Amino acid sequence: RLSVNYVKGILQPTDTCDIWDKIWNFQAKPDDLLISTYPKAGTTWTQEIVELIQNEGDVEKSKRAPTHQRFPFLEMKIPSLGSGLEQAHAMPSPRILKTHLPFHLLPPSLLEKNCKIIYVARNPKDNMVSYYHFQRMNKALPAPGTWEEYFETFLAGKVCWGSWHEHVKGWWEAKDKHRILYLFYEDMKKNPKHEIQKLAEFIGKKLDDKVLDKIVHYTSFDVMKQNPMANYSSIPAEIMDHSISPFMRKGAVGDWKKHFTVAQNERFDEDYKKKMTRLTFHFQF
Amino acid sequence: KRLSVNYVKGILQPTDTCDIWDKIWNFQAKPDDLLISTYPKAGTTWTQEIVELIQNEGDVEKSKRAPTHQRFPFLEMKIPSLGSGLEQAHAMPSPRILKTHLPFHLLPPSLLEKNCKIIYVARNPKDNMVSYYHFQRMNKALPAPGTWEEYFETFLAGKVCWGSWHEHVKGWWEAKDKHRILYLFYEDMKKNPKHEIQKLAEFIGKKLDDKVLDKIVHYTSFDVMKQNPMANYSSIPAEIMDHSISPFMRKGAVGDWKKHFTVAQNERFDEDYKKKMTDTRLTFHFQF
Ligand SMILES: Nc1ncnc2c1ncn2[C@@H]1O[C@H](COP(=O)(O)O)[C@@H](OP(=O)(O)O)[C@H]1O
Ligand SMILES: Nc1ncnc2c1ncn2[C@@H]1O[C@H](COP(=O)(O)O)[C@@H](OP(=O)(O)O)[C@H]1O
Ligand SMILES: Oc1c(Cl)c(Cl)c(Cl)c(Cl)c1Cl
Ligand SMILES: Oc1c(Cl)c(Cl)c(Cl)c(Cl)c1Cl
Ligand SMILES: Oc1c(Cl)c(Cl)c(Cl)c(Cl)c1Cl
């Protein structure tokens, strides 16, 4: 596995730590769209939707290259994948950018330029489960240990990008005074058309029902799982082993119930209440 | 090596194919017999220890004379190298303190005809399931439990020795209305041991002073009994029980099930439980 270290208080792959100053001083464009998420909150889904909205349903164009090549992952720097920062550097407008950075670590240019930001939050228990399996299959990230160990690791924020709680909280507090659309993975799953419409309005695109319906179809889990440009199948096998756990794993809400013991659930809820707001009303515990 | 299990009168038993049921059913009780009755793992060993110390007014010496299984005849038991509970009962001087796991409808009628005092102990089914799971892992007289996920469904289905937990606790709860049964709960015993000891003493008919009550509370605590070689099942042939797999005195805690059940298992359990428990007020009693 690739090594990780602390940069500005959060675990990151070693190569990200080494280029922090470069990341911090990222140069945004006023017309950049930023997709911001805690890892495994629904980044790939949201990116696919946002591009399809921007290109008005042009499914052929979204198949031009895989997700990681289409969308610069700002803080990412991994051997065989290059630097997301430099991917963006070279890229002409309109850019659709990705980050998992907690809000306090966000390159200030993105705020200075008042870029439209889409933040997606996900139920933390499903988020833990998704991140657990991701660490099992992704060798750029630390070994997760046993489920029992990982539960504690996640709870304490000792995973890359830090505390889930701090992450969702900082971004929620930020939405009040910045150009942020704050969405929930669960709302997207329950009524994708409604959330896609909300996205389009925020992006400033008027779409008719036909195109909206088309985006709902192409961005459904069962369709995206089969799309070799959207399912992370194109990542070198030396980094992501889909036979351990596929990137497009389940795409469901409530998978956490199959993983959490009642004891873990009670400990999680107790811990949550201590760390955590109106944000709480948007999750089902 | 695991011992074969067989159906006897509709329930699995850790016993051979030579049917000796009639002898058990025709067991000859005495009016001063005390009976401790439990679903497997509901708190038999604990209750026996309390009951004898009450009967002997706190005489801990007497209770150390031999281990649990030799002090207390296990009526339906017939296991290679363990002998026969029936023969052990026949040989046991009065006043006997007897043990059974039989569901109420299979109870030898002499225990009823003689109006014997019976102490039944129920335990919440989730902790009961977990306790029985680990007991089957360690105890070679019982079936191999399979995986935890398999055993969960086996237990839910009542396909374990002594049958359905649900039917067991319900039958005994209904029985208490017509027969001389003191119906106790493991969780009450754990939460206020002194209170349940006083209740038992009054039922058995012993007027114990405060010092004796406190003494029994001390000696029947999990931590003390766990270290007591006459009360912890250490003396069972190593070929029957392997305590290195799981000790008989495992945790002695209410809510240990929470470390075993996933939330999904819990929801499946709770729905199953509702469907099986609509006709009993027992449910207003179980603590988890
Ligand atoms: N179209 C879609 N609908 C719902 N979930 C999707 C999706 N595409 C990807 N996902 C899920 O979102 C998670 C990945 O998030 P990210 O893109 O932020 O890394 C995975 O969750 P699971 O591991 O629960 O399946 C993945 O299956
Ligand atoms: N003094 C005591 N206090 C609480 N629990 C006790 C106890 N003595 C034994 N037990 C528990 O009762 C269960 C055994 O029941 P039985 O005697 O009917 O076979 C075991 O539960 P656990 O497996 O949950 O530890 C055992 O640890
Ligand atoms: O979201 C991602 C994270 Cl957190 C890592 Cl570490 C990697 Cl390698 C990839 Cl590809 C994605 Cl998509
Ligand atoms: O309660 C018991 C049961 Cl059910 C069996 Cl099968 C055995 Cl072998 C023993 Cl020792 C006890 Cl205590
Ligand atoms: O002998 C004992 C008596 Cl009588 C009491 Cl009351 C208590 Cl609490 C303890 Cl610990 C012992 Cl050892």
Residue numbers in the entry:
A (entry chain A): 16 to 291, 294 to 302
B (entry chain B): 15 to 302
List passages from the publication reporting this PDB structure.
Cytosolic sulfotransferases (SULTs) comprise a family of enzymes that catalyze the transfer of a sulfonate group from 3′-phosphoadenosine 5′-phosphosulfate (PAPS) to an acceptor group of the substrate. In doing so, SULTs modulate the activities of a large array of small endogenous and foreign chemicals, including drugs, toxic compounds, steroid hormones, and neurotransmitters. As expected, all SULTs share the same basic fold: a central four-stranded parallel β-sheet surrounded by α-helices and three loops that are often disordered (dashed lines) in the absence of PAP and/or substrate. The crystal structures of SULT1C3 bound to PAP, apo SULT1C2, a ternary complex of SULT1C2 bound to PAP, and the environmental toxin, pentachlorophenol (PCP), and SULT4A1 were solved at 3.2, 2.0, 1.8, and 2.2 Å, respectively.
In order to better understand the mechanism of inhibition by PCP, we determined the structure of SULT1C2 bound to PAP and PCP. The structure reveals that the protein undergoes a disorder–order transition upon PCP and PAP binding. Helices α4, α5, and αı5, and loops α5-α6 and α15-α16 are ordered only in the ternary complex, but not in the apo SULT1C2 structure. PCP is found in the substrate binding pocket and therefore appears to be a competitive inhibitor, consistent with crystallographic analysis of SULT1E1 bound to PAP and 3,5,3′,5′-tetrachlorobiphenol. Comparison of the SULT1C2-PAP-PCP and SULT1E1-PAP-estradiol structures revealed two structural features that may be relevant in explaining the mechanism of PCP inhibition. In the co-crystal structures, the phenol moieties of PCP and estradiol share the same relative position and orientation, positioning the phenolic OH within hydrogen-bond distance of the catalytic histidine. Our structure shows that PCP appears to be in a catalytically competent conformation. However, PCP and estradiol differ dramatically in the acidity of their hydroxyl groups; the estimated pKa for estradiol is approximately 15, whereas that for PCP is 4.5. Thus, although PCP appears to bind in a catalytically competent conformation, the phenolic oxygen of PCP may be too weak a nucleophile to attack the sulfonate of PAPS. Although steric and conformational factors clearly play a role, our structure of SULT1C2 with PCP and PAP suggests a key role for the electronic nature of the halogenated phenols.
